[PDB]
Amino acid sequence: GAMAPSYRVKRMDIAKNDEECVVNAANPRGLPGDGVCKAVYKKWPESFKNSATPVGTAKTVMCGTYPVIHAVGPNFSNYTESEGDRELAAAYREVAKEVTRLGVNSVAIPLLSTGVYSGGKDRLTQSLNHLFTAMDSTDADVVIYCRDKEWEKKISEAIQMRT
């Protein structure tokens, strides 16, 4: 475990993370995809061997000794708000199980279902709150990655609010 488990946020490419493992915002078919998933494919392509997994699950594949946790959030274009919310919460619960099983002291994680799977809605708060629900009981240092300057400020504020 980390000596004083923390949350932090950084605005940069998650493929340049300084953590002991990474969470990919994967598609269910283990395809290279776009956004976070394409960056992850370019950096760790060996981790896409048999990485296909259903919505609401996470599947870990090693790139050398570096773990890539493929977490599949729902595409809110296809799911109802209700069913999508349940699957987005479940994906993060499976991430916490994998992070625990791997024994890592730190994890880089993107906000699942906030990009092309968002169904055109701002889901910062929804996705971040499901992240916290899952990861609060783990003792890994969590570093959240994003692209947008306004999102960095809002994620930082939400972390600081809990102290």
Ligand X SMILES: COCc1cc(C(N)=O)no1
Residue 56: CB minimum distance to ligand X, A: 21
- Residue 35 is assigned to a ligand binding site: yes
Query: Nearer to Cl ion by C-beta: 24 or 106?
Result: 24
117 is known to lie in a ligand binding site: yes
Which x/- pattern over 103-142 shows residues binding ligand X (rule: CB under 6 A)? ------------x---------------------------
Rounded to the nearest 5 percent, the helix, strand and coil shares of the chain are 40, 20, 40
Sign of the CA dihedral running 79, 137, 67, 150: positive
Shortest distance, position 158 Cβ to ligand X, whole Å: 17
The listed partner (Cl ion, ligand X, none) that binds 145, CB under 5 to 8 Å by sort, is ligand X
Measured in degrees and rounded to the nearest 5, phi and psi for residue 87 equal -75, -35
Say if residue 50 carries a ligand binding annotation: no
CA distances from 18 to 78, 92, 112 (A): 34, 21, 20
Q: How far is CA 21 from CA 12, 44, 100, 128, 163, in A?
A: 16, 11, 12, 19, 25
- Site residues (CB under 6 A) for ligand X, limited to 40-99: none
Residues making up the annotated binding site for ADP-D-ribose are 13, 27, 35, 115-117
